Amino acid sequence: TGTAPMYKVTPTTNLVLDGETLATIKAQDNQIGNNLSPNETYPKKGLS
Amino acid sequence: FTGNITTSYSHTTDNSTAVQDSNGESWNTGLSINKGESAYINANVRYYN
């Protein structure tokens, strides 16, 4: 939702269940998005 | 004054048959533990500056 695209998107996510963080996962080769243009999504709109 | 002597002999032949039917049920529970690696620990932490 920004103004510039991002390359090699590697987010870090917390999984929380009932006040406890199950895990903190950093994106790896299978979860890295090559391109992410503004106002777009990875995967794209028509993909799972 | 009376007396008596008796001698007897007997022979017996026997045949038998039997049928048995058995049914059984069993229920087991088990628990095992390793004394070297008994549990794992996860710490929820935050950093400060």
UniProtKB/TrEMBL annotation, chain B:
Domain of life: Bacteria
Name of the featured protein: Iota toxin component Ib
Organism: Clostridium perfringens
Range of the intact protein held here: 348 to 396 of 875
